[model samples]
Target: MKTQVAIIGAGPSGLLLGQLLHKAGIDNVILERQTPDYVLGRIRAGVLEQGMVDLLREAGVDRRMARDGLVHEGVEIAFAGQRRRIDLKRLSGGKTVTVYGQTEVTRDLMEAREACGATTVYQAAEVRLHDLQGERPYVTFERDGERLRLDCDYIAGCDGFHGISRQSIPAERLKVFERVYPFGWLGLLADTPPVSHELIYANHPRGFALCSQRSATRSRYYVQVPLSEKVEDWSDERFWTELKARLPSEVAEKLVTGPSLEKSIAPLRSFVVEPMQHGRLFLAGDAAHIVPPTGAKGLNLAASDVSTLYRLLLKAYREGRGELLERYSAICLRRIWKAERFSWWMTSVLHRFPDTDAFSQRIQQTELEYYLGSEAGLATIAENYVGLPYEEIE
Candidate 1:
């Protein structure tokens, strides 16, 4: 089989790239190691930045998102039993985030891909990328004990952190930067109305807690937990008790608790790799980077990566501007490092680190006070929270 681009992994990044490329009259094929149901089953946070929301609109998959997605104008921060709301719209010059789940985003993209008759092979086994360093690149995988080969001009490694795309690059050529936190988030998803119309991030002596929602009726809450804590040890009631204890009385009083529909613990980490593209291969989404969910950037970063690649590919194919490919890594890294810092900062201020001493605690308190108390500090937080501008394709 032959296609212009061979995309590995059928997640939102790959699907969104495929949809965008297809709309531009570029043919592409997607290979997935999981079935459709499995892809939909993996739950992930989705707080869409203004940039990603616009990208989805550009991809022509905005019909459902526009109708069902929740637009949050601001987010509240609670510390020392006091809650302050940051007006993201006012501070960021009319920017806001949408509370749409990642599952929903993937579903929308998958449906759009199917409707357009773009090829996506689910359950592709032993998928491997070959000849990525040369002018001709191809992917090989097996299905039902039969091997198949897909030849393409370029390959997109959207297979995520564990995927083979990055691993395919010789270790001598790639540079990595990573930081694993001392704790994890014990998250619980429930079917009750959210405590507040907008998300609330709480910082207390006990720990950090977040009251976030996917829609008006579904809520996702989390509390910082020691890395040793096990999901099996906590009950639905226990999670609510811990969460409420961390929240300010005003916000906690309005909380509505219910049976948890899902529960899990996600360890926090900040990760990235340099030179997002090598030869004919360009890494997109998790394959290139991942940030802590504190800033809700994992998916948005993916969207930006795809957008960058999509524009570059279109320019390359349509106008013979192949040289633009070399700019992909540097452009993506500039924005990615900013986001990585924000996520790290958010996690640092809100979370109770194990080794933080008396002086460090005082600094954390002052950092929150100084930032939330001043207009300039507030704008900086809001500007990053709503996401920065995507670099122009030029």
Candidate 2:
């Protein structure tokens, strides 16, 4: 069978890209190796940058989200015994982030695509892309009892880092840049109300911790841990005990604890592969780059990529501007590299480095102080946090 575009994964990036393309009257098929439930099970970064929220609105999938997502005007940065608020709205000139889970975004996108009656083959296996450098690209995959071949004009490689999309490009054709951090984030989600209404990024003598939430009744918190930290070693009590000690006495006093709905340790790493496009297959989201979650750029970065691809694809079909396709990689990488820098910078400043000495400790302290203390410094942080503007396709 043939499709206008063959999407390699059904995660948020793929689902979102498919939805946007569908609205543009483009025919696309999404293939996922996991079932719908399995895909939804991965709890990810919940903060949505403003650009992403606008994109969701553009796709007409923001009805439930606009009603339910929490608007965070400011985020607190706590150090020593005091906390400071970065007024994101004021600093960014009327921009604020929405605290909505990535899972919910996926759910909405899936439902939106379903409304369009688009082809999405879940539980697809052994997916492979061929003729990426040729005019006609295609995907071959196995599902249920049959092996299917899908020919398409182009391939949208929304498959993540572990998937086969990037690898489909010859190894020598792509240059990989990466940094593996010395620590991992041990996160816990519970049914208790959040300790704070807004997200709090805390740096303590012990380690870094974040006070985050999915909603008023559901809290998601994380603490910095050594790479070797084991999830099995942390009971609910132990996790809360450590989290409390890292928070300010004022906030911890009202902290509520409950049985964990989820717990896991995720290693922090920044990975990027250059030239996000290779022939007819365009890599989006994690397929092209991954930022440390410190800046909360994971899902948001993917949204910008979708927007660019969506606009460019529309032009390609409607205006006969196939030449613009080659511009995809550069346009995406420009915004991506900025987010990557911010995520890396935030990670370095907030987290307790394993090799820290007194001099380095003092330096880290001053870095946070200056950034949080000054108006311009705060705006710099706020502007990036709320997300940079998407590159225009001229």
What RMSD does each model have against the real structure?
0.9, 0.8
* Model 1 lDDT, full chain set: 0.93
> In model 2, which regions exceed 4 Å deviation?
none
lDDT of 2 by residue, 1-394 (tens): 8899999999999999898888889999999999999999999879998889999999999998999999999999999788999999999999899999988998998888888899999999999999988888889999887999999999999999898999999999989999999999999999999999999999998999999999989999999999888999999999999999999998999999999999999999999998898899999999888899899999999999999999999999999999998899889889999999999999999999987789999999999999988989999999999988888977
Candidate 2, position 189, lDDT:
94
Q: List the residue pairs that clash in candidate 1.
A: none
Give candidate 1's error at residue 391 in angstroms: 0.7
- In model 2, what are the clashing residue pairs, if there are any? none
State the weakest 10-residue window (summed lDDT) of model 2. Answer: 385-394
Q: Residue-wise lDDT of candidate 1 within 1-394, one digit each (tens)?
A: 9999999999999999999999999999999999999999877875999899999999999999999999999999999979999999999999999999999999999999999999999999999889887899999999889999999999999999889899988887889999999999999999999998988899989999999988888999999999999999999999999998998887889899999998999999999999888889999999999899899999999999999999999999999999999999988998999999999999889989887789999999999999999999999999999999999967
Q: 9, model 1: CA deviation in Å?
A: 0.8
